[PDB]
Design a protein around this ligand. Sequence first.
Ligand SMILES: Cc1cc2nc3c(=O)[nH]c(=O)nc-3n(C[C@@H](O)[C@@H](O)[C@@H](O)COP(=O)(O)O)c2cc1C
Ligand SMILES: Cc1cc2nc3c(=O)[nH]c(=O)nc-3n(C[C@H](O)[C@H](O)[C@H](O)COP(=O)(O)O)c2cc1C
Ligand SMILES: O=C(O)c1cccnc1
Ligand SMILES: O=C(O)c1cccnc1
Lengths: 216, 216
Amino acid sequence: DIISVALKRHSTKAFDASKKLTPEQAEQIKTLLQYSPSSTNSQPWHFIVASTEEGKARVAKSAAGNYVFNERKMLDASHVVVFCAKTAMDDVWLKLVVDQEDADGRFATPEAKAANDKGRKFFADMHRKDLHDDAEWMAKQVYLNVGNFLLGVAALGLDAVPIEGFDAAILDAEFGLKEKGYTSLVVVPVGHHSVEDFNATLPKSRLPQNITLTEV
Amino acid sequence: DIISVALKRHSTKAFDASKKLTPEQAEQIKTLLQYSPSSTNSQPWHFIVASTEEGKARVAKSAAGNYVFNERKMLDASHVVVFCAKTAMDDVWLKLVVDQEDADGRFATPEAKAANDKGRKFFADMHRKDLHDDAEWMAKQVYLNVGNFLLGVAALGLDAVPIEGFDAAILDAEFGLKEKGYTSLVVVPVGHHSVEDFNATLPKSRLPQNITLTEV
Ligand SMILES: Cc1cc2nc3c(=O)[nH]c(=O)nc-3n(C[C@@H](O)[C@@H](O)[C@@H](O)COP(=O)(O)O)c2cc1C
Ligand SMILES: Cc1cc2nc3c(=O)[nH]c(=O)nc-3n(C[C@H](O)[C@H](O)[C@H](O)COP(=O)(O)O)c2cc1C
Ligand SMILES: O=C(O)c1cccnc1
Ligand SMILES: O=C(O)c1cccnc1
């Protein structure tokens, strides 16, 4: 069943502009985005969900130059999700997280809450103060969300395609992302594929496990 | 249904060492590892699946020290997956990939294969030659694999826990990954939680959508 989803799922190359998500599906994809796991529950992300013609047109502006070939996808799909990562890990965000966990009832005592904050604060520093790779660290969490989203959407019976071929400088500018602390990394149009999706009937291809997998 | 899977899964803090994956499930998680999508279908990864007592112990060594809280999870879980990313993208691997799609029958003509090879190399060179984010780029694809794997495993009725808290240098050394061209990124113990898993009862917590998601 889930393996069936994983084996039949595919990157749609063309969407049917007349096929939309049901209001229920639309709510579900947002839930998928929100509840993805992340290191220390950092959730260093922001998402832009374009579902209107005007909204999608703005996103598609990022599909120019060498990426015009991805424009149709953004324009024709039902919903287009823009996965964004924070550009820097700050204490105000760290406090926001632990406070949400607290409001959600994950701490039986203030010291348990302090212990959690110190733990998160410890790995955040290791990345920003020591390794100096917090941008990459948070960007990795976003991709993990993307991975969770792609399988999820497929299990909902919806078509989608993860997109890296777009101009992030344009996309960020179009939504003032940098001046808000974020930068776009991946774009994911969602909907139903059209008869023009040649990849819907092509066999899936992956390297043999004897190359990529070792058992011990 | 898959939404329920997303809302119900949780990071397992303790596993029951007596609860092993069935031969079928052990095979499904590998299928899961293999079929994750990736940019350009480059599949810049290698997986180490430890299931014997000795193998899991070797992986566990990487958690000794400042990551002791993650050590038990690695010894008690039925299967422990180590997600590794290629450390550099070489033309041999690009050759291996495009030849697999060919063997799997994704190209109807030689020009199609060449055109695909050309497109894949254009983005590979962009990352290695122009952006020099070659390693981070492949690492991100591995995380996308992780995200897909965590949802999939959960939908399989299995417990798991993503782990960044481990010494990658130790792990890399134990399995001679550096000379092999890979580096460990995240460890994922899979199995069934024991009554010791205090996180199986705590409520899940996530930041509000009114701050993380913009609709247009
Ligand atoms: C992070 C990421 C970015 C990618 N970019 C694009 C893109 O810009 N345009 C496109 O047509 N496909 C894109 N792909 C789609 C596929 O090339 C890869 O998912 C496919 O070759 C492996 O196939 P399948 O997804 O149908 O299973 C990307 C995939 C991932 C995971
Ligand atoms: C890449 C990554 C690394 C993480 N590392 C660890 C770890 O080293 N130890 C641990 O106990 N939990 C670890 N977590 C689990 C989380 O703190 C958890 O994903 C999060 O707080 C949200 O809770 P949930 O997974 O139960 O939904 C990690 C999560 C991700 C995605
Ligand atoms: O999310 C956690 O608890 C965590 C993440 C990285 C390292 N150690 C712990
Ligand atoms: O997988 C692709 O086809 C792809 C990935 C990144 C950028 N452009 C195309």
